[PDB]
Amino acid sequence: ENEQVSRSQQRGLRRVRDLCRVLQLPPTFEDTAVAYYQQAYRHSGIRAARLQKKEVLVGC
DNA sequence: TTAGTATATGTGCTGCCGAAGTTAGCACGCTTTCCACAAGATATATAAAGCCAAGAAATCGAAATACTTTCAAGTTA
């Protein structure tokens, strides 16, 4: 893995990690967040969505 | 034709600094576009309550006067 990933998904993951580190959440929280983000990205409706949509996806 | 001279001939010398390799015994431990597919942005009840900002009324806070008290100095005695 980490090779069949788009630049948009990579930016989303990096934003997730950045917000996690800003809120100072543990690495377990970081891992759970990235896992849930990947699980949500698996779907196509969220995959091909808006920029604000994917930002709110990071947030949620 | 022969002695003197210039060249390259490979050879052998010198340093040249660097090259590999060495050093003993346990326990712990980014950009352009380009691209195509599907997702904004759109009417429309629709009951429901909570929220977020103008107005209108209300009462709290208190300030400028109206009463009473109080002295203190002065009166009829």
One DSSP character per residue, chain A reads: --SS--HHHHHHHHHHHHHHHHHT--HHHHHHHHHHHHHHHTSHHHHT--HHHHHHHHH-
**Chain B bases near protein Cβ (<7 Å):** 31, 38-40
Determination technique used: cryo-EM
The size of chain A, in residues, is 60
- Nucleotide nearest A14, from its CA to each C1': B30
Phi, psi of A6 (to 5 degrees): -85, 160
* Strand B proximal to A49 Cβ, under 7 A: yes
Over the range A13-36, which residues count as b (16 or more CB within 10 Å of their CB) and which as e?
bebbbeebeeeeeeeeebeebeee
Q: Which residue, A4, A27, A14, is CA-closest to A54?
A: A14
